[PDB]
Design a protein around this nucleic acid. Structure first.
Ligand SMILES: [Mg+2]
Ligand SMILES: [Mg+2]
Ligand SMILES: [Mg+2]
Ligand SMILES: [Mg+2]
Ligand SMILES: [Mg+2]
Ligand SMILES: [Mg+2]
Ligand SMILES: [Mg+2]
Ligand SMILES: [Mg+2]
Ligand SMILES: [Mg+2]
Ligand SMILES: [Mg+2]
Ligand SMILES: [Mg+2]
Ligand SMILES: [Mg+2]
Ligand SMILES: [Mg+2]
Ligand SMILES: [Mg+2]
Ligand SMILES: [Mg+2]
Ligand SMILES: [Mg+2]
Ligand SMILES: [Mg+2]
Ligand SMILES: [Mg+2]
Ligand SMILES: [Mg+2]
Ligand SMILES: [Mg+2]
Ligand SMILES: [Mg+2]
Ligand SMILES: [Mg+2]
Ligand SMILES: [Mg+2]
Ligand SMILES: [Mg+2]
Ligand SMILES: [Mg+2]
Ligand SMILES: [Mg+2]
Ligand SMILES: [Mg+2]
Ligand SMILES: [Mg+2]
Ligand SMILES: [Mg+2]
Ligand SMILES: [Mg+2]
Ligand SMILES: [Mg+2]
Ligand SMILES: [Mg+2]
Ligand SMILES: [Mg+2]
Ligand SMILES: [Mg+2]
Ligand SMILES: [Mg+2]
Ligand SMILES: [Mg+2]
Ligand SMILES: [Mg+2]
Ligand SMILES: [Mg+2]
Ligand SMILES: [Mg+2]
Ligand SMILES: [Mg+2]
Ligand SMILES: [Mg+2]
Ligand SMILES: [Zn+2]
Lengths: 104, 159, 205
RNA sequence: GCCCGGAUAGCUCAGCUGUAGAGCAUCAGACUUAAAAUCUGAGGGUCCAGGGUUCAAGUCCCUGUUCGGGCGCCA
RNA sequence: GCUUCCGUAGUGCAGCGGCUAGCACGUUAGGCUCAUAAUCUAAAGGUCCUUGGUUCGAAACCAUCCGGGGGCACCA
RNA sequence: AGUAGCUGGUUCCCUCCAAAGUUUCCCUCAGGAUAGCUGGCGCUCUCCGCAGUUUUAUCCGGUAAAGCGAAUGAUUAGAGGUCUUGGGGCCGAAACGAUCUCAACCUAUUCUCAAACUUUAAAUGGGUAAGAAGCCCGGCUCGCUGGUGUGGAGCCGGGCGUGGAAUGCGAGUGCCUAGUGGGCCACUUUUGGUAAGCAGAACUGGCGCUGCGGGAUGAACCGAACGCCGGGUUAAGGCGCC
RNA sequence: UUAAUUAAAACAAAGCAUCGCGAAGGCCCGCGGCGGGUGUUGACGCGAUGUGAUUUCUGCCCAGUGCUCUGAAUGUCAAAGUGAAGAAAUUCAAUGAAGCGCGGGUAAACGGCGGGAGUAACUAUGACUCUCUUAAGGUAGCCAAAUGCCUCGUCAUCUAA
RNA sequence: ACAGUGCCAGGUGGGGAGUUUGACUGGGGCGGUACACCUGUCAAACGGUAACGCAGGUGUCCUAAGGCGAGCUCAGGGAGGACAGAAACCUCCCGUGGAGCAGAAGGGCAAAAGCUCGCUUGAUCUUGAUUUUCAGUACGAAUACAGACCGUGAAAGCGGGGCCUCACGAUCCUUCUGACCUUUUGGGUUUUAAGCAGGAGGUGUCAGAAAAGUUACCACAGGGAUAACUGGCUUGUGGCGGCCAAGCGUUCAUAGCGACGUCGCUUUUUGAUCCUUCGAUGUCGGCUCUUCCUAUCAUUGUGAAGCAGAAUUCACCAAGCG
RNA sequence: GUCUACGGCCAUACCACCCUGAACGCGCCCGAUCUCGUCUGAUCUCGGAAGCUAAGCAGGGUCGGGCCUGGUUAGUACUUGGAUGGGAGACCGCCUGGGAAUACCGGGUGCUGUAGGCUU
RNA sequence: UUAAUG
C-alpha cells in the first residue's frame, strides 16, 4: 500500500495533534546479553543437542507492517508504533495517483 | 457443517418488504423510548449499524439503558439448558413498541375507573376477564320458508 | 443404453432443474411439443380429449417422445395429415442424475446429470388432442395406444371445453356471437368490460 | 540475519569525483556481378530507484528492489 | 476416474495483456543458369481449439467445453 | 511390581433414587477435559410463587400451497402489426414507389416449471403481557439535558386489596459428585444413493435400562409398564382342534 | 549354501578390469599406551572393489550425484592473535586455515542413452528431407526370452486337435 | 623443533546412537480438506441442525476504494447532428436501479451507500460494558456509550477504517516505544540487565509438538468399531420373461422376429453396504462322490409354421433317464 | 371551498391524455451592478415585477393502466394430532381442529397536524 | 572458399 511520510496525529506527551515523520519499522539486532538469550546459550552449551524447538512450518507469506511515527516538534520527539493490516507491496509516499488520466 | 457467521441465512429476514425500500420513515426515529417499556425487535436491512442478531429477530424485551442513537434492552434467550435474561444494544431502526403492554394498561385504567365507580352504590360488578362461555339458549325463528334441503352433489370429472 | 424407468419412476428428490448451478445436461429427445394442423382456428376443431394422470410419478422425456410418435401415427392413419392437433402439456425440466460405477464406491456419491424427466401430479393433463366432432372414438383409440408408453396408470377424459380453451362449448358460440371472445389462432381472446371504450368502439366498428 | 560480487546502448564486459570505452548486433557508403567474408563513418546509454556530501557523483555514503555464492538458525 | 500438460501460418516452434504475433521450412514472383539446383532479391499466409469472464486492453490471467499426451489404479 | 488411551476379571443381602452415547476444545476420532443428565448432604420460607397446557391481546416468518396475463432464470405454439432492419427473388437504372413473402423485433395471448426465484401466503410454532416489584397524589436532589421550579432519573411521606383469565402443583437456593461422551429402531418431514436390514439429519416415543398379554416364533410392532396374594373387569388380540 | 519346509539359476571359483599405499604409509582394531593385525610383509606385496571359464567385443554421454586435482589470483569461513573508542564489561574494524563455490579430469564410479511431419510414376514400406530438444538420444548384438501390457502378437514346423 | 601428545575451535561423518514419520476417511493406501473462516441452499416459515451433500469464495487490496460537505444520476433504448460507419464527440426524451458500491454470494442503497470535486487523517490515545463463536472461556470480528484531542460542514450532526455478513493467532523467547516509573540487593553514581504498559517477529494440523521412508525377516496389545472369502438386505450391472405395435418377413404387425417406450423375476456374474466371524469358520482350480432346481439339449406324449417329405424353428405337460 | 411554508402515514397519493382555474399565493418571467458559480446568469446566487395561466401547480374526467380494499376461486390446495384404514407400491379416503393464493367480478382514486393567508 | 545434375 501507499502511506505518506508526514502524518498529523495524536501525541502522547504533548496531548494534541502534531505532525509525525513516518518510517517503516524493522527488527533490531538480537542482544547476546538478554535473559532468554543467556538462558538459551547456557542450555545449548554442553551435550544434548538442540534443546529448544526450531520452528519450520512457515505458512503465511507477508508480515504486519509497522509505522514508526516520530514527532516533528524538537522538544517532544516522542515515538510510538502503529499497526496496519497485512500487505504484500508497501511503499512510503510514492506516486500519489490521479483521477481520469491516460493510461499508457 | 454450517458456518457460524453473523448474517448466515438472513436472505429474507433483514430484507425490506415489496415496494417498501428507500428512505427510512422518520417517526420511527423520533419516537421516544422510556426505561422499562416492553419492546419487540424487528430487524431492518437499510441501516446496517446497530443491527440485532438473527436469534433476537422477533424477540421481545424491555429497555434498561438509553443512549443518544440507541437503547439497551434485556431480552430472554434460550440457550441449550435454560433461559437467560441478557442485554443487547440496539439502534433505533430495529425497535418498535409492543402493544401487549398498552392493552394491559388500558384494561388496568378501565378496572380502576370501574373500581372508583359503584363504590358508594354497592353493586358488585365483575372485574376479572371471564373466558368465552357456553352460550345461552336461544330461539331460532324459522319464519316463513322451511329450511333448505342440502343435497350432496354427484361426482363429475372436471380435468 | 440407460437405466430402466423402475429406478426413477417416483418423485423422490426435490425439483432439480437445469440452471446456472446444474450445467452439463444433455438435450432431451422431445423438442417438438405439438403437431397436426397447429396453424388453425378454434372453430374448426371443436372436440378435445385429454390424457389425465392418476399417479404422482415421474414420466420420462423418452416416454413422452414415444407416446407422441404413437399418437402421431394413428392420427395420420385416421384423421389425415391436417385433421387433428396433438399437444404434449408436460415439458420435462427435472434433471435426473446417474451414479456410474466405472473403486471409490459410495464416497463422494453425487450424480452427474443423466437426463430429463417431468414431474407429474395427480389430476394433470399429459397429452391433449383437439379434432372435429366426428373423430371421437379415434382420439380415444389414439390415447389408448399412447397410454402403453407411460408407466403407472392414466385415464382418458373428453373435455367439456372448446378445444384448447378454458370456456365451455355450449357457451362458446354465444360468447363469440356477443363478441366477448375473438378467435386468435389456437387460443382465444377474452374481452372484459374493464378496458377503455376505444377498444369497444374498435370492436363494434 | 551477515559478508562480497552485478544491474551500464538490442547482447557480453571496462570505467582513479572534472563527448562513459572495447567487442558482437543495426543502418548507411566501399569491395565482389551479389549475399556472406572484410574495411569506413553514424545512431542507440532512465549508468536499478530515491535521498544525502560536494561547486560538480555512474563512482563517496546509507536506504530499499532484482541476481548469485558461502555462512547462521530458541517465537 | 484422479492429478497434471497442450491446442498458434501449409509443417515443426516460439511468445514478460498494450505486436505489424516471431524462426525455419513450404509456397508464389523475379534474377543467376543452356535448364535444374543451389544462390541472390522480393511476397502471402495465422478463426491465435471453442464460450465466457476479469481488464480501459486478453494469443496468454479465470472458468468451463472439445482434442491430446503422460502418471496412478493398491494389501489383502 | 518398567508402561499400556489396549483385552480379561473384580468376592454378602435388602431398601430408595436413577442415566448417557449429546455442546465445545485437544496430533482429538478405542481416550481425556468441559457443559448436560444423576445421586447424596443440606439450608431458607409456606400450610405467595411455578407450569414441555389452553385462552385473551400483541409482534416474527417465507416453509406447504400458489404464481408466471408480476420481477429473475427457463420454456412451447399459434394471431395482429409497421418499415424497426435483413437474408432469396420479382417489376423496377434506382426510389420507405409498389409487391407476395420469409426471418428476427413489437403488441395482446397461450402450455409447462424453479432447493440455491417470487408479488401473495397458511397449519404447526417462537417471543411478551395477563398487577402490590401496580396505579394516583405532594415534595426534595442532580455537577445530565435544558426558552420555561422544562425533560429524565433517584429519593422520601401517604391513599388505593374485588390477589385483577382457565386449570393444575408446596417452592426457591448452595455445595460435593459417580457413570456417560461407540448407539439403534419407529408415524411424519427430508439429504446422498437404482435400492438396501445403506449412509446422514429435524420432532417425539421406545429399545438400550423393561418384565407382562397379544403379533406362532421375535431387543424396537399394538396394548400396557412390574412389591406379595384373593374376588371381579377389560385393553391389544381372539372364540373348529392344538 | 538357508542344522529342522527353498541344494537352486543362488554363493564361491579361476580368468578379466579398476582404486589406494614407498612405511612419520594404505586398510583395520583398541577406553589407553613408544599399543596391536596385515607384518617372519614391501608393488610379481597388502588392503578395497566390480564382473565371472574359452571365443567375439565393451559403442555414446561428465547435464546430475560421487571421487580426484590445482590454489594468496580469492567470495565465505570458527577459535586464538592484532588494532579500536569507552570508566570497564565491550562492540567495531583489519587479518583470516580446512571445507564449501570458482577452474580441469574420470563412466570396467552411480547411472542414463528422444519426439513430430512430408517424401520412390498402382498402393504400402518408405532410403531421403524439414523441425523441437538434450549431456549424448541405445551402437554392435539379441528377443513375445527368466525380460512383451495388448497377447492365446503374425508366419512356418511339431499334432487329428 | 617439526610429526606427536593434552585442550579448545570449524568442516565432514547413517560408520554408529536416540527419536519421528499428523488427522478426517462408507477398510486402509492414492486422491481431496469437508482441519481455521464466509455466502445461498439443505433446514421442515424464531433460533439450532449432519454426510468426502450442491454451487462458490479467503489468507488479499486500498493515501483511498477511509471521514466529512457540495453538485450530479446510473445501465440501457429512441430521435438527430461534417468527416462518423454496429461502435470516437454533443444534445433532447424515456429510464425504481434492469448500473455501480475491489473481490464469492446474499441483503441494502437515487438530491445515496454510486460518479466528480474541496479539505483532511476518527485507520490517534485511554478505561470499562455488550453481542457473535460459546462451556456462556478465550482469539478474531462487531455493537452502543464515556473521557481527551481532532477532521469536515454554515449548522444540525457525521467519523474513532472499508455499506453489512469473511480476510486471521495463546504461554515462553526476541525487537521497538512510553513514564525526570521500580529493582539491580551494605550504601551512592553511571553503563548493563530484570520489571509495568502498548504493537510487532507464529505456530494454515489455524485453542498453537521441533519430525523422512521401508519391512515378504518382522513383533506385541487389541478390533469383526475396520477390509480380503461364505452367508445377509439391495439388484445398478449380468442373465431371463412379459405389455403396446412403427416396421422386417416377395403379398402380411404378431409363422418367426420386433425398434421407439415400459413392467417384472433371479441371486448361477460383477457391484453397493459392513450385520455375523480377527483368543482363526483353512484361501482358487482339478479328481472322486451324493442329492436337488428348471430358465428342456436329446428321449415320451402333444399343438404352430413362411411344416409337401427330410431337416429345422416356436410353445406346453415334464427333471424319469443321459 | 381553497392555497402557501414546515410535515406524519408514504401510489386510495403513481403514470398517459383531456378540460377548468375567481382572489391571495405559488410559479412562469425581466436583467447581471453587487454576493456567488459556470464553456454558457441554462443550474446556483443576486436585484426586481412589464406580461401570463402557456407550463409547473390545484381540482375534475378516462366502460384508462397501476395501486388499495371485498366476493369468487373454496372449505379448494395445504396442514396439528389418530387409527391393527385401503393399496404390491405410488399415494388416497376418513375422525379432530385450522385454513390459502392466481385467473375472473364489484367499489374507491388521498386523509391529517402546526402557523399564516384568500373567498374581504 | 563454393561449384551437384541432364
Ligand atoms: Mg561444545
Ligand atoms: Mg433423495
Ligand atoms: Mg484410544
Ligand atoms: Mg429458508
Ligand atoms: Mg412448492
Ligand atoms: Mg467408548
Ligand atoms: Mg461419537
Ligand atoms: Mg441411518
Ligand atoms: Mg427410562
Ligand atoms: Mg417395554
Ligand atoms: Mg407373524
Ligand atoms: Mg399408537
Ligand atoms: Mg386377577
Ligand atoms: Mg389363538
Ligand atoms: Mg532349508
Ligand atoms: Mg531339501
Ligand atoms: Mg564397475
Ligand atoms: Mg559400456
Ligand atoms: Mg562429474
Ligand atoms: Mg537396436
Ligand atoms: Mg552418520
Ligand atoms: Mg539410525
Ligand atoms: Mg487414519
Ligand atoms: Mg422449524
Ligand atoms: Mg451527498
Ligand atoms: Mg465508501
Ligand atoms: Mg468521543
Ligand atoms: Mg549485586
Ligand atoms: Mg511386501
Ligand atoms: Mg524380500
Ligand atoms: Mg461389522
Ligand atoms: Mg460373497
Ligand atoms: Mg438389467
Ligand atoms: Mg410391411
Ligand atoms: Mg453402520
Ligand atoms: Mg471346519
Ligand atoms: Mg416348464
Ligand atoms: Mg435568467
Ligand atoms: Mg398554469
Ligand atoms: Mg391550463
Ligand atoms: Mg382503472
Ligand atoms: Zn510531540
Amino acid at each position: 500500500v501507499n502511506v505518506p511520510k508526514t502524518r498529523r496525529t495524536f501525541c502522547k506527551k504533548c496531548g494534541k495533534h502534531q505532525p509525525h515523520k513516518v518510517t517503516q519499522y524493522k527488527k533490531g539486532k538480537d542482544s547476546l546479553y538478554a535473559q532468554g538469550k543467556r538462558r538459551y546459550d547456557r542450555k545449548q552449551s554442553g551435550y544434548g543437542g538442540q534443546t529448544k524447538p526450531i520452528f519450520r512450518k512457515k505458512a503465511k507469506t507477508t508480515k504486519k507492517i509497522v509505522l514508526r511515527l516520530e514527532c516533528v516538534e524538537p522538544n517532544c520527539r516522542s515515538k510510538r508504533m502503529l499497526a496496519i493490516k497485512r500487505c504484500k507491496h508497501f511503499e512510503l509516499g510514492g506516486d500519489k495517483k490521479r483521477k481520469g488520466q491516460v493510461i499508457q | 457443517t454450517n458456518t457460524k457467521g453473523k448474517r448466515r441465512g438472513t436472505r429474507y429476514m433483514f430484507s425490506r418488504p415489496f415496494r417498501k425500500h428507500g428512505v427510512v420513515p422518520l417517526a420511527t426515529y423520533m419516537r421516544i423510548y422510556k426505561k422499562g417499556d416492553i419492546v419487540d425487535i424487528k430487524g431492518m436491512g437499510t441501516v446496517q449499524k446497530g443491527m440485532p442478531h438473527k436469534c433476537y429477530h422477533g424477540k421481545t424485551g424491555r429497555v434498561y439503558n438509553v443512549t443518544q442513537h440507541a437503547v439497551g434492552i434485556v431480552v430472554n434467550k434460550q440457550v441449550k439448558g435454560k433461559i437467560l435474561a441478557k442485554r443487547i444494544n440496539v439502534r433505533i431502526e430495529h425497535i418498535k413498541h409492543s402493544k401487549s403492554r398498552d392493552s394491559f394498561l388500558k384494561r388496568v385504567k378501565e378496572n380502576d375507573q370501574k373500581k372508583k365507580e359503584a363504590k358508594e352504590k354497592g353493586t358488585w360488578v365483575q372485574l376479572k376477564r371471564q373466558p368465552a362461555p357456553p352460550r345461552e339458549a336461544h330461539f331460532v325463528r324459522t319464519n316463513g320458508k322451511e329450511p333448505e334441503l342440502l343435497e350432496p352433489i354427484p361426482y363429475e370429472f372436471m380435468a | 443404453g440407460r437405466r430402466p424407468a423402475r429406478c426413477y419412476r417416483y418423485c423422490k428428490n426435490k425439483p432439480y432443474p437445469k440452471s446456472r448451478f446444474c450445467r452439463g445436461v444433455p438435450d432431451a429427445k422431445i423438442r417438438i411439443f405439438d403437431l397436426g394442423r397447429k396453424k388453425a382456428k378454434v372453430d374448426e376443431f371443436p372436440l378435445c380429449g385429454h390424457m389425465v394422470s392418476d399417479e404422482y410419478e415421474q414420466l420420462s422425456s423418452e416416454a413422452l417422445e414415444a407416446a407422441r410418435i404413437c399418437a402421431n401415427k394413428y392420427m395420420v392413419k385416421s384423421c389425415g395429415k391436417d385433421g387433428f392437433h396433438i399437444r404434449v402439456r408436460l415439458h420435462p425440466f427435472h434433471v435426473i442424475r446417474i451414479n456410474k460405477m466405472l473403486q471409490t464406491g459410495m464416497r463422494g456419491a453425487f450424480g452427474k446429470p443423466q437426463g430429463t424427466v417431468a414431474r407429474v401430479h395427480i389430476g394433470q393433463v399429459i397429452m391433449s388432442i383437439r379434432t372435429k366432432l366426428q373423430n371421437k372414438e379415434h382420439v380415444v383409440e389414439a390415447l389408448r395406444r399412447a397410454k402403453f408408453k407411460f408407466p403407472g396408470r392414466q385415464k382418458i377424459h373428453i373435455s367439456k371445453k372448446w378445444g384448447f380453451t378454458k370456456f365451455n362449448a355450449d357457451e362458446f358460440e354465444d360468447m363469440v356471437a356477443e363478441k366477448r371472445l375473438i378467435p386468435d389462432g389456437c387460443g382465444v381472446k377474452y374481452i372484459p368490460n374493464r378496458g377503455p371504450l376505444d377498444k369497444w368502439r374498435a370492436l363494434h366498428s
